[PDB]
Amino acid sequence: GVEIETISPGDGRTFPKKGQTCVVHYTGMLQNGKKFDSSRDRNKPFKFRIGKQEVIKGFEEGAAQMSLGQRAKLTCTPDVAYGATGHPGVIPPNATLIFDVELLNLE
């Protein structure tokens, strides 16, 4: 259970299935609003395969319930996210994450 707030509507019916690549442009921030990641910044659309346990499970499950052109404001749970270990340097221990993700293309 992660909070998926839709922002813009896409087309809804063509959703990403299991076993495809996901072209996502995404910008992540902490709960406090401080920005720790982007993809508009580095200017490369992100890509990953569903199910291969590459991206974190909150990002994966929230990218599952979208479609083409739809953008979402995921509010991911820290226990589904990096957890109490967090990440040494970027993410503090047990902080909620706010992703603004947007799909562009699939496979």
Partner 1 sequence: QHLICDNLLPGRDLLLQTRLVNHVSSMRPNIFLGKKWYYELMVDHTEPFVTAEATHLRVGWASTEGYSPYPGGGEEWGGNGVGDDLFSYGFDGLHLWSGCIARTVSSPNQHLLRTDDVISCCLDLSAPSISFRINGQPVQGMFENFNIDGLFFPVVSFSAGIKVRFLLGEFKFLPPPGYAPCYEAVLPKEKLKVEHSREYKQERTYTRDLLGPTVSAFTPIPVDTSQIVLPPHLERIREKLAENIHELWVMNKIELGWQYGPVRDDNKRQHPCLVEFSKLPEQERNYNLQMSLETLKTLLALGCHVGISDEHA
Q: How far apart are alpha carbons 105 and 84 in whole angstroms?
A: 33
Annotate each residue in 81-100 with x if it binds partner 1 (CB under 8 A) or - if it does not, as one string. Answer: -----xxxxxxx-------x
Q: How far apart are CA 1 and CA 14, in angstroms?
A: 22
For residue 7, count other CB atoms closer than 10 A to its CB. 11
Closer CB to partner 1, 5 or 79, in the complex: 5
Catalytic pick among 46, 48, 56, 100: 56
Count of C-beta atoms within a 10 Å radius of residue 100: 17
106 within 8 A of 21, measured Cβ to Cβ: yes
Q: Which of residues 47-86 bind partner 1 (CB under 8 A)?
A: 71, 73, 86
The yes or no reply on residue 34 touching partner 1 (CB under 8 A) is: yes
CB of 46 to partner 1, least distance (A): 14
Q: Are 96 and 34 in contact (CB under 8 A)?
A: no
Q: Residues in contact with partner 1, total (CB under 8 A)?
A: 24
> Catalytic site residue 26?
yes
Instruction: Give the residue numbers annotated as catalytic, written as ranges.
Output: 26, 36-37, 56, 82, 99
